[PDB]
Amino acid sequence: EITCQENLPFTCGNTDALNSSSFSSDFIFGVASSAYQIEGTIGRGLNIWDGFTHRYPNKSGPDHGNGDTTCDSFSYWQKDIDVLDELNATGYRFSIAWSRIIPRGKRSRGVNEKGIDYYHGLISGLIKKGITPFVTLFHWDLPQTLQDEYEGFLDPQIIDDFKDYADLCFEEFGDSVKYWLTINQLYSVPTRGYGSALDAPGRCSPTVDPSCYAGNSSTEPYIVAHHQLLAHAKVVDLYRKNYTHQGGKIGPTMITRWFLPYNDTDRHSIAATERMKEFFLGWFMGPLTNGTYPQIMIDTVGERLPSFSPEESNLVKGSYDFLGLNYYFTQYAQPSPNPVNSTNHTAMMDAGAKLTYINASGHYIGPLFEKDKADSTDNIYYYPKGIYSVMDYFKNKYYNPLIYVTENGISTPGDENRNQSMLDYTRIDYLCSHLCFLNKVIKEKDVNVKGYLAWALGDNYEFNKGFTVRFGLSYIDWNNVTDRDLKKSGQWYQTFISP
Amino acid sequence: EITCQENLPFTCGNTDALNSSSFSSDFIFGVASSAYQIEGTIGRGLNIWDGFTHRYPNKSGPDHGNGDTTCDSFSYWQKDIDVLDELNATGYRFSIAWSRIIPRGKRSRGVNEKGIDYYHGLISGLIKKGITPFVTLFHWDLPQTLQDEYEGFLDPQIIDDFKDYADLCFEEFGDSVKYWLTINQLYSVPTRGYGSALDAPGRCSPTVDPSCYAGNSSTEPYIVAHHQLLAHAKVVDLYRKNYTHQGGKIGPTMITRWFLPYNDTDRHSIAATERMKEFFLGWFMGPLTNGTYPQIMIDTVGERLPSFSPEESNLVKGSYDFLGLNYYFTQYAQPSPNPVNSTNHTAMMDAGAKLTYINASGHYIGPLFEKDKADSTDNIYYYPKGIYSVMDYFKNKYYNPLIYVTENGISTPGDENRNQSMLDYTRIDYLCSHLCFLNKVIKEKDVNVKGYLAWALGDNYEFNKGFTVRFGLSYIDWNNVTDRDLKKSGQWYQTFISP
Ligand SMILES: *[C@@H]1O[C@H](CO)[C@@H](O[C@@H]2O[C@H](CO)[C@@H](O[C@@H]3O[C@H](CO[C@H]4O[C@H](CO)[C@@H](O)[C@H](O)[C@@H]4O)[C@@H](O)[C@H](O[C@H]4O[C@H](CO)[C@@H](O)[C@H](O)[C@@H]4O)[C@@H]3O[C@@H]3OC[C@@H](O)[C@H](O)[C@H]3O)[C@H](O)[C@H]2NC(C)=O)[C@H](O[C@@H]2O[C@@H](C)[C@@H](O)[C@@H](O)[C@@H]2O)[C@H]1NC(C)=O
Ligand SMILES: *[C@@H]1O[C@H](CO)[C@@H](O[C@@H]2O[C@H](CO)[C@@H](O[C@@H]3O[C@H](CO[C@H]4O[C@H](CO)[C@@H](O)[C@H](O)[C@@H]4O)[C@@H](O)[C@H](O[C@H]4O[C@H](CO)[C@@H](O)[C@H](O)[C@@H]4O)[C@@H]3O[C@@H]3OC[C@@H](O)[C@H](O)[C@H]3O)[C@H](O)[C@H]2NC(C)=O)[C@H](O[C@@H]2O[C@@H](C)[C@@H](O)[C@@H](O)[C@@H]2O)[C@H]1NC(C)=O
Ligand SMILES: *[C@@H]1O[C@H](CO)[C@@H](O[C@@H]2O[C@H](CO)[C@@H](O[C@@H]3O[C@H](CO)[C@@H](O)[C@H](O)[C@@H]3O[C@@H]3OC[C@@H](O)[C@H](O)[C@H]3O)[C@H](O)[C@H]2NC(C)=O)[C@H](O[C@@H]2O[C@@H](C)[C@@H](O)[C@@H](O)[C@@H]2O)[C@H]1NC(C)=O
Ligand SMILES: *[C@@H]1O[C@H](CO)[C@@H](O[C@@H]2O[C@H](CO)[C@@H](O[C@@H]3O[C@H](CO)[C@@H](O)[C@H](O)[C@@H]3O[C@@H]3OC[C@@H](O)[C@H](O)[C@H]3O)[C@H](O)[C@H]2NC(C)=O)[C@H](O[C@@H]2O[C@@H](C)[C@@H](O)[C@@H](O)[C@@H]2O)[C@H]1NC(C)=O
Ligand SMILES: *[C@@H]1O[C@H](CO)[C@@H](O[C@@H]2O[C@H](CO)[C@@H](O)[C@H](O)[C@H]2NC(C)=O)[C@H](O)[C@H]1NC(C)=O
Ligand SMILES: *[C@@H]1O[C@H](CO)[C@@H](O[C@@H]2O[C@H](CO)[C@@H](O)[C@H](O)[C@H]2NC(C)=O)[C@H](O)[C@H]1NC(C)=O
Ligand SMILES: *[C@@H]1O[C@H](CO)[C@@H](O[C@@H]2O[C@H](CO)[C@@H](O)[C@H](O)[C@H]2NC(C)=O)[C@H](O)[C@H]1NC(C)=O
Ligand SMILES: *[C@@H]1O[C@H](CO)[C@@H](O[C@@H]2O[C@H](CO)[C@@H](O)[C@H](O)[C@H]2NC(C)=O)[C@H](O)[C@H]1NC(C)=O
Ligand SMILES: *[C@@H]1O[C@H](CO)[C@@H](O)[C@H](O)[C@H]1NC(C)=O
Ligand SMILES: *[C@@H]1O[C@H](CO)[C@@H](O)[C@H](O)[C@H]1NC(C)=O
Ligand SMILES: *[C@@H]1O[C@H](CO)[C@@H](O)[C@H](O)[C@H]1NC(C)=O
Ligand SMILES: *[C@@H]1O[C@H](CO)[C@@H](O)[C@H](O)[C@H]1NC(C)=O
Ligand SMILES: *[C@@H]1O[C@H](CO)[C@@H](O)[C@H](O)[C@H]1NC(C)=O
Ligand SMILES: *[C@@H]1O[C@H](CO)[C@@H](O)[C@H](O)[C@H]1NC(C)=O
Ligand SMILES: *[C@@H]1O[C@H](CO)[C@@H](O)[C@H](O)[C@H]1NC(C)=O
Ligand SMILES: *[C@@H]1O[C@H](CO)[C@@H](O)[C@H](O)[C@H]1NC(C)=O
Ligand SMILES: *[C@@H]1O[C@H](CO)[C@@H](O)[C@H](O)[C@H]1NC(C)=O
Ligand SMILES: *[C@@H]1O[C@H](CO)[C@@H](O)[C@H](O)[C@H]1NC(C)=O
Ligand SMILES: *[C@@H]1O[C@H](CO)[C@@H](O)[C@H](O)[C@H]1NC(C)=O
Ligand SMILES: *[C@@H]1O[C@H](CO)[C@@H](O)[C@H](O)[C@H]1NC(C)=O
Ligand SMILES: [Zn+2]
Numbered sequence: 001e002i003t004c005q006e007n008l009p010f011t012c013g014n015t016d017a018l019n020s021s022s023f024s025s026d027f028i029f030g031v032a033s034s035a036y037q038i039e040g041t042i043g044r045g046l047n048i049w050d051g052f053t054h055r056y057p058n059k060s061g062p063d064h065g066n067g068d069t070t071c072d073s074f075s076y077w078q079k080d081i082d083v084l085d086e087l088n089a090t091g092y093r094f095s096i097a098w099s100r101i102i103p104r105g106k107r108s109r110g111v112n113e114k115g116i117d118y119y120h121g122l123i124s125g126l127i128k129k130g131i132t133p134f135v136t137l138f139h140w141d142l143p144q145t146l147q148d149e150y151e152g153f154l155d156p157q158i159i160d161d162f163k164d165y166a167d168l169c170f171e172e173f174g175d176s177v178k179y180w181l182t183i184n185q186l187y188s189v190p191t192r193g194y195g196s197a198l199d200a201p202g203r204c205s206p207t208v209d210p211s212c213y214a215g216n217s218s219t220e221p222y223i224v225a226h227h228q229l230l231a232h233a234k235v236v237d238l239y240r241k242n243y244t245h246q247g248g249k250i251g252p253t254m255i256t257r258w259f260l261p262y263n264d265t266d267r268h269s270i271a272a273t274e275r276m277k278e279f280f281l282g283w284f285m286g287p288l289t290n291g292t293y294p295q296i297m298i299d300t301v302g303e304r305l306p307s308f309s310p311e312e313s314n315l316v317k318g319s320y321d322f323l324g325l326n327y328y329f330t331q332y333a334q335p336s337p338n339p340v341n342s343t344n345h346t347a348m349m350d351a352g353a354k355l356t357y358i359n360a361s362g363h364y365i366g367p368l369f370e371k372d373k374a375d376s377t378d379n380i381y382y383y384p385k386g387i388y389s390v391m392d393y394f395k396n397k398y399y400n401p402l403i404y405v406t407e408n409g410i411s412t413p414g415d416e417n418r419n420q421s422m423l424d425y426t427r428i429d430y431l432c433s434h435l436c437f438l439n440k441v442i443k444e445k446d447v448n449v450k451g452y453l454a455w456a457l458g459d460n461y462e463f464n465k466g467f468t469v470r471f472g473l474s475y476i477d478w479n480n481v482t483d484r485d486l487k488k489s490g491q492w493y494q495t496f497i498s499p
Numbered sequence: 500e501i502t503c504q505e506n507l508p509f510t511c512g513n514t515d516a517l518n519s520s521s522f523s524s525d526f527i528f529g530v531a532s533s534a535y536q537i538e539g540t541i542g543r544g545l546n547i548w549d550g551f552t553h554r555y556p557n558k559s560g561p562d563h564g565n566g567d568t569t570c571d572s573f574s575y576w577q578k579d580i581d582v583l584d585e586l587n588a589t590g591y592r593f594s595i596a597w598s599r600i601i602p603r604g605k606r607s608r609g610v611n612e613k614g615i616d617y618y619h620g621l622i623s624g625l626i627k628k629g630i631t632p633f634v635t636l637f638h639w640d641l642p643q644t645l646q647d648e649y650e651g652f653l654d655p656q657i658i659d660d661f662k663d664y665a666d667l668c669f670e671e672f673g674d675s676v677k678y679w680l681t682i683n684q685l686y687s688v689p690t691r692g693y694g695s696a697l698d699a700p701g702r703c704s705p706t707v708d709p710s711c712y713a714g715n716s717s718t719e720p721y722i723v724a725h726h727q728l729l730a731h732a733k734v735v736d737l738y739r740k741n742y743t744h745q746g747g748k749i750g751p752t753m754i755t756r757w758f759l760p761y762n763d764t765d766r767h768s769i770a771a772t773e774r775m776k777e778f779f780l781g782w783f784m785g786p787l788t789n790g791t792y793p794q795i796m797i798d799t800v801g802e803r804l805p806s807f808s809p810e811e812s813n814l815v816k817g818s819y820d821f822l823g824l825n826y827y828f829t830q831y832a833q834p835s836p837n838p839v840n841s842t843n844h845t846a847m848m849d850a851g852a853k854l855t856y857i858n859a860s861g862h863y864i865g866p867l868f869e870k871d872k873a874d875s876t877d878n879i880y881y882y883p884k885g886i887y888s889v890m891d892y893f894k895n896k897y898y899n900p901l902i903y904v905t906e907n908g909i910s911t912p913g914d915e916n917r918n919q920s921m922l923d924y925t926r927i928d929y930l931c932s933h934l935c936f937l938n939k940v941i942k943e944k945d946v947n948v949k950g951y952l953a954w955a956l957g958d959n960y961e962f963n964k965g966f967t968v969r970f971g972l973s974y975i976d977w978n979n980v981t982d983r984d985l986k987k988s989g990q991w992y993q994t995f996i997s998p
Contacts, residue, residue: 041553043710046545046643050553054540054567055602068553068567103554103712104647112712144545145647148603211542213602213611 002443004436006385008367012432013425013492019499022439028132028451029497030084030091031473032407034139034184035100037460038073038080043114045103047141048152049463052200056211059198061466063414070461071476071484074118081125083457083474083484088498091132093324093406093453094122095139095184098165101172105143107164116172123176134324134406134453135173136181136253137166137235140189140200140463147201151214153189153224154203159231166235170243178248180239181324181406182232185255186284189228190221195346198464207343218340219304221347226306229287233312233319240321249321253406254284256327258386258393262334263360272353273333277393279351289398291317300338300350324406325394326455327434329369330386331355357381367429370411370469382410384433388441395447402448408434409455411462411469422475427489435496454493458484501942503935505884507866511931512924512991518998521938527631527950528996529583529590530972531906533638533683534599536959537572537579542613544602546640547651548962551699555710558697560965562913569960570975570983573617580624582956582973582983587997590631592823592905592952593621594638594683597664600671604642606663615671622675633823633905633952634672635680635752636665636734639688639699639962646700650713652688652723653702658730665734669742677747679738680823680905681731684754685783688727689720694845697963706842717839718803720846725805728786732811732818739820748820752905753783755826757885757892761833762859771852772832776892778850788897790816799837799849823905824893825954826933828868829885830854856880866928869910869968881909883932887940894946901947907933908954910961910968921974926988934995953992957983 005012012018020029036049049067053060060066073080084092098105100115126133142152150157166182174180183189192199195217197208203215232252239250259276261269275296278286282294291313292298297305308316336354339345357365357380369380387408394401410430412421431454441447459472467478473490477483486494504511511517519528535548548566552559559565572579583591597604599614625632641651649656665681673679682688691698694716696707702714731751738749758775760768774795777785781793790812791797796804807815835853838844856864856879868879886907893900909929911920930953940946958971966977972989976982985993 040556042556044554045647046550046553050549051545051602051643054545054549055543057539057541057568064568066567068565069556069563103550104650106647109647109650110713114710114712143647144550145644148544148605148608148642148644149648151603151608211613213613214609 002436002440004384004440005433006366006383008429010429010433012436013428015495015499018432018436018439018496020497021499023442026450028091028404030089030093030131030453031087031457032093032453032455033073033080033095033457033460034136035095035097036067036139036141037462038071039097039100040067040069040072040074042074043118044097044100046144047097047099048144048147048200049141051144051147052202056202059202059464061462061464062468063466065461065466065468067461069481071458071481076482077118077122078125079482079484080457081129083486083490084126084131085129086486087490087494089131091134091451091453092126092457093134093136093181095136096169097141098138099141099143101168102165103143105145106161107168111168119173123173127176132179133177134179134181134404135177136184137169138162138182139184152201153227153231154194154220156227156230158227159234162231163234163238167238170239170246174243174246174248178246180248180250181253182235182250183228184253185326186225186228186252187255187280190225191348194220194224195348205343205345208346217346222301222304222306225283229284229316230312233316236319237315251320251322251324252284252288253324253326254281256281256325256390258330258383258389259333260330260365262332262356268335269333272335275351276333276353276355285398287316288320289317297350300352320401322402322404323394325390325403326407327387327390327405328382328408329380330365330383331357332359332365371413382430384437387434388437391438391441391447391449392445395445400448402450404450405438405452407453407455409471411471414468414470418475418477421470422485422487424487424489427473427487428492431489431493501935501939503883503939504932505865505882507928509928509932511935512927514994514998517931517935517938517995519996520998522941525949527590527903529588529592529630529952530586530956531592531952531954532572532579532594532956532959533635534594534596535566535638535640536961537570538596538599539566539568539571539573541573542617543596543599543611545643546596546598547643547646547699548640550643550646551701555701558701558963560961560963561967562965564960564965564967566960568980570957570980575981576617576621577624578981578983579956580628582985582989583625583630584628585985586989586993588630590633590950590952591625591956592633592635592680594635595668596640597637598640598642600667601664602642604644605660606667610667618672622672626675631678632676633678633680633903634676635683636668637661637681638683651700652726652730653693653719655726655729657726658733661730662733662737666737669738669745673742673745673747677745679747679749680752681734681749682727683752684825685724685727685751686754686779689724690847693719693723694847704842704844707845716845721800721803721805724782728783728815729811732815735818736814750819750821750823751783751787752823752825753780755780755824755889757829757882757888758832759829759864761831761855767834768832771834774850775832775852775854784897786815787819788816796849799851819900821901821903822893824889824902825906826886826889826904827881827907828879829864829882830856831858831864870912881929883936886933887936890937890940890946890948891944894944899947901949903949904937904951906952906954908970910970913967913969917974917976920969921984921986923986923988926972926986927991930988930992
């Protein structure tokens with residue numbers, strides 16, 4: 001019988017008690033990255049994260065940081081491989097920058113051979129060290145040209161441009177890459193990119209944020225989400241019809257959270273909690289498992305919710321071999337009004353829920369996850385049991401899928417000096433406590449989880465935060481980015497992997 | 500009788516001997532800037548100078564600098580006005596960033612109202628201080644979307660997108676702006692952007708520079724130059740047909756140089772010198788004055804030189820009310836082979852000339868202009884008489900045009916400390932020696948020159964050089980960009996203007 005801790009102090013950093021041998025022999029352990037966050041702009045065209053961070057520097061991070069140079073994995077990809085080799089990792093998730101291989105967006109405009117060569121060399125280097133690549137086609141970095149031609153995922157033109165990009169990736173890299181992710185965190189671009197305008201491309205209703213160049217936060221999230229699902233599904237169909245000889249697997253990436261009632265004896269909070277599951281997870285998992293959006297979304301969102309045709313429904317339903325599930329934290333849910341006629345209405349209001357990290361009796365859900373220095377009542381707290389609850393829910397609700405945990409990690413402040421930054425015991429605690437619950441759910445609930453990739457390989461540009469936080473298991477000096485030095489967490493993870 | 504110095508030491512920094520009163524009462528004196536170089540990316544979309552500097556950081560400058568934040572004239576435009584007011588300047592040349600007012604490139608995709616407001620406030624502030632705006636529509640910063648959709652000026656689609664952009668500018672700003680420049684330095688994008696790939700977008704033949712993503716240095720410069728002329732001419736026709744009520748004037752910007760024979764008794768060097776005038780100046784001025792390219796270009800370039808239809812010829816011929824002439828330096832010319840079958844052939848080779856700053860007897864043409872620390876035999880030297888020779892030539896060869904000198908200036912090294920940087924006596928010498936010759940040519944040759952704008956108002960991002968050189972008449976601290984402090988040159992220029 002497995003017992004796992006939910007509160008500080010944690011004792012799962014002892015590899016005598018928790019290590020890779022606790023999991024099945026074939027289980028993959030590694031780390032993750034994304035292209036905007038690590039590569040730099042050298043050698044690629046411009047994408048909407050370049051555009052957004054440059055047009056709206058205060059939205060890029062408090063330091064106005066961006067991905068222009070970052071950790072320079074364009075130059076230092078071998079050093080990334082070296083970290084993975086030091087870890088004895090068996091997996092690495094990275095993304096392909098669309099703008100590096102097709103700078104002009106549309107494949108018929110030509111490819112960048114040198115960009116293709118960059119990923120060939122990375123892939124070959126990984127495989128030579130026994131590391132399985134997990135490759136994200138689209139980690140938010142849409143070529144700027146496509147956003148300017150037709151507003152990107154706002155328009156159905158995205159589907160064929162994404163398909164042709166993906167086809168090039170399968171053609172060039174699929175002989176070696178056997179695990180593909182289509183779109184990173186399906187929920188995020190619709191809501192943050194087109195709802196709150198916290199993320200690229202930065203569209204919203206005028207009264208939500210007067211700096212947005214255009215948008216409608218009530219309608220566009222739904223349009224974009226719908227196009228994401230269709231573009232994803234078209235790529236999965238292309239993969240499974242035209243690249244079956246490659247013997248690989250493909251799936252989407254979800255951001256997952258668990259949700260608990262703010263007041264577990266209040267029917268209204270219980271209802272809000274179940275609505276959140278539907279609106280947060282079901283928005284995408286309903287289509288992916290059934291070809292339809294959840295009924296509560298149909299009912300609430302009404303004419304703002306697009307319909308799938310019968311052909312589209314069939315294309316989207318079942319459009320995965322596995323799910324990449326990202327998991328960071330859990331929220332309490334309580335009811336909230338949905339003012340659909342307000343000029344500041346957002347899609348996110350349609351769930352009719354307010355989310356907190358403290359429940360009605362004043363209980364904080366778990367240890368600190370992210371401090372918010374401008375408003376401490378907005379601090380985020382984590383909840384290790386949430387990974388158990390999410391995986392159990394996916395198994396039970398969503399037809400026992402094959403799952404890889406494609407991100408899980410925690411930040412430390414960029415204000416810490418290097419010695420403090422390397423002494424990242426809070427990261428060991430977060431990672432181990434989640435791994436304990438992941439082992440527990442696999443054993444107790446028989447969830448088909450076959451790997452775990454911690455966020456992040458190394459310090460990088462963090463969307464929305466610049467270089468003001470660090471997520472890496474290895475440390476990068478922003479004054480001299482060449483080295484990636486394993487932190488205490490990376491050293492712990494090395495021991496966990498090879499105990 | 501006016502006597503002007505050609506060699507150090509110069510004594511024209513004495514405003515007792517040379518000042519604004521030496522020129523006609525109406526003559527405009529000011530300074531110049533461009534949008535990529537000064538504004539920053541905040542509040543605008545991405546353009547090909549963002550793309551180029553980010554994809555090819557070693558081509559942005561030795562420091563890998565770029566226009567992301569620069570002097571932040573987005574925030575500090577009032578401080579630019581303040582410099583101009585301190586100078587008692589009567590003119591200011593600035594550019595509109597296309598990506599700030601139409602981030603999606605094509606006008607039908609929507610405009611950025613806040614971008615429009617930015618230029619309205621600048622323009623209104625200038626006029627309130629008695630400063631005449633000279634506004635460049637296109638200072639190289641093409642929206643990235645257009646380059647990615649159709650490769651920008653490589654394709655005739657540029658013409659209508661440029662026209663619709665210009666129409667928006669005339670509509671929004673032409674009630675106040677009475678001097679418009681279409682395209683900055685017509686020669687530069689074809690040759691550097693599409694020939695040598697030193698400049699955005701960075702296209703060339705594969706053996707010219709293997710880093711180029713695509714291109715053909717032998718053909719594309721000509722295509723791009725042809726489209727520039729057509730796009731320019733379509734905008735001038737639009738202006739003069741639809742905006743005549745505004746009572747303003749429009750013209751192109753030329754980069755001018757003079758050319759002297761490397762050996763003034765050698766017929767081959769004399770011939771190369773005359774070819775250079777045709778290939779450098781006539782490439783554009785032939786079309787602008789006659790609707791045809793120079794015969795030597797027709798003959799040499801052959802099938803690589805596009806033809807104008809009779810309608811196009813008529814549109815381009817006479818498509819200016821004035822010329823903005825930029826002038827920095829003069830070169831000696833000697834013959835050079837034109838290897839049209841070589842895989843590394845460039846359009847620039849078609850002139851059949853090699854350019855130097857030292858003549859056959861070892862004479863350097865004038866004082867140092869720009870030191871090249873990697874190769875000192877590649878140092879640039881200036882030649883004050885060249886402004887006289889250029890203006891005389893334009894009057895005689897090109898039908899006595901109205902001229903404004905739209906740039907003239909010199910750099911100092913970014914390695915200098917602030918006190919050295921503010922003690923910019925080399926800049927006084929360059930500016931005064933050229934102003935002396937400009938007065939001389941107006942008086943002696945009756946060239947219709949009606950203003951002079953020195954490059955640059957303040958230190959900025961220099962194309963190709965990052966922040967490794969400074970051109971400003973006012974100093975900017977890159978650690979805190981708010982202030983623009985007049986250098987010795989700016990203080991001199993203040994006295995020259997109001998002696
Ligand atoms: C998994 O996918 C299944 C589909 O493959 C989902 O089942 C569908 O659920 C639909 C409701 O979401 C349901 O459709 C309703 O059908 C009513 C019956 O119509 C038939 O008989 C009519 C009925 O009197 C007639 O007009 C129709 O022409 C048919 O003959 C119908 O009125 C409904 O329309 C009203 O409600 C929708 C909102 O739900 C409004 O958008 C619409 O304007 C109208 O106001 C609805 O019809 C659907 O209307 C929209 C139109 O685009 C669709 O094509 C039309 O179908 C449908 O019958 C079933 N299909 C079957 C095969 O069962 C299933 O939903 C879950 O299970 C069903 C039983 C129900 O409990 C749902 O609430 C659950 O979500 C999906 N499962 C999951 C887990 O999501
Ligand atoms: C200012 O613009 C003026 C035009 O408005 C320029 O004058 C034109 O100069 C053209 C040469 O560049 C000249 O065209 C040549 O015409 C030859 C005569 O053709 C007529 O009689 C024929 C002759 O036997 C017959 O086939 C034609 O159908 C006509 O009836 C002719 O062969 C020439 O073609 C050969 O040379 C061109 C290269 O120059 C090759 O491209 C072509 O394949 C061929 O090998 C040339 O014809 C032009 O051919 C190209 C085609 O696209 C053009 O439409 C065709 O016209 C033309 O006659 C005159 N036009 C007039 C009205 O004078 C003027 O040029 C300068 O002055 C002229 C006198 C000459 O000295 C030029 O070298 C100078 O540049 C321009 N001025 C300046 C300063 O540039
Ligand atoms: C978790 O949710 C539960 C369920 O909602 C909360 O308990 C409910 O709390 C209500 C007060 O917020 C209680 O109603 C009140 O009852 C007193 C005594 O009769 C009365 O004077 C009030 O006016 C009020 O009555 C309601 O007024 C509004 C009418 O529309 C409605 O019909 C009336 O019910 C309610 O009885 C209680 N329900 C239960 C089943 O206990 C619970 O609140 C926490 O516990 C209750 C017992 C009370 O001590 C609250 O102070 C305390 O906050 C909530 N838990 C937390 C931690 O918020
Ligand atoms: C400025 O250009 C002028 C004109 O080209 C240069 O003068 C010419 O310089 C040529 C040498 O580069 C002289 O030709 C040579 O004459 C000597 C004496 O006969 C002879 O032994 C050589 O072989 C050579 O003759 C040529 O060989 C190649 C044959 O195809 C050709 O037919 C022969 O001419 C040439 O006479 C001279 N022309 C004139 C009109 O003087 C001039 O060069 C400079 O001055 C000359 C006089 C000489 O002192 C050169 O050393 C010196 O460089 C050049 N000025 C500069 C500074 O480069
Ligand atoms: C978001 O787009 C929706 C749909 O176009 C706009 O909502 C509508 O508003 C028009 C004008 O009021 C209404 O007549 C419709 O009844 C509404 N339709 C629905 C589906 O709600 C909403 O004004 C736009 N919001 C913003 C801020 O522009
Ligand atoms: C807030 O969260 C706390 C902690 O999960 C809940 O408290 C638990 O309540 C259960 C059922 O009453 C008790 O058995 C436990 O002993 C309590 N745990 C502790 C740490 O207090 C609490 O019920 C939640 N409040 C609401 C209103 O939902
Ligand atoms: C530049 O484009 C020119 C024109 O397409 C290419 O030049 C031609 O080369 C083809 C193949 O040799 C030739 O048959 C033609 O005779 C040439 N045409 C002319 C007008 O010169 C040139 O190969 C291309 N250069 C590069 C590096 O791709
Ligand atoms: C190189 O440039 C120098 C300077 O312009 C030329 O020298 C002048 O030559 C003229 C005509 O012979 C003499 O009258 C001057 O006195 C010379 N000036 C000085 C400063 O020497 C020289 O002729 C040029 N060389 C060539 C080969 O063209
Ligand atoms: C691995 O952890 C298991 C408990 O899951 C433990 O029994 C085993 O001895 C540990 N391995 C090492 C080498 O410490
Ligand atoms: C940040 O930038 C936007 C312009 O993009 C401006 O609207 C907003 O006021 C600025 N935010 C703060 C908090 O200053
Ligand atoms: C598959 O490849 C063939 C060859 O390009 C193409 O005809 C077919 O449409 C593609 N298939 C998809 C997505 O099924
Ligand atoms: C607009 O929304 C903000 C945040 O969503 C809220 O605090 C404010 O009350 C809203 N105003 C109206 C008019 O509803
Ligand atoms: C930068 O870091 C690398 C790796 O530690 C080191 O070899 C190189 O010398 C350092 N550069 C400077 C300028 O210190
Ligand atoms: C790498 O992991 C394999 C598999 O568990 C193990 O056999 C090998 O010893 C490990 N190597 C190192 C250096 O830890
Ligand atoms: C201006 O320069 C002229 C010579 O061009 C001179 O005569 C005049 O006195 C100077 N003005 C002043 C105020 O020094
Ligand atoms: C600069 O960058 C390019 C890649 O864009 C590379 O091809 C070239 O070798 C580098 N230049 C130098 C001098 O290192
Ligand atoms: C002028 O404006 C009118 C109204 O848009 C348009 O019909 C006409 O084509 C434009 N003219 C140009 C470039 O001449
Ligand atoms: C190619 O050109 C470079 C510079 O243009 C030159 O130095 C080299 O000799 C040329 N090579 C050939 C094959 O002509
Ligand atoms: C930056 O420069 C401005 C103008 O001199 C000054 O007022 C401001 O205090 C300076 N900021 C810092 C942080 O020194
Ligand atoms: C501004 O220039 C005008 C025109 O020459 C002159 O009358 C006025 O005195 C000058 N002002 C200053 C402060 O120099
Ligand atoms: Zn940047």
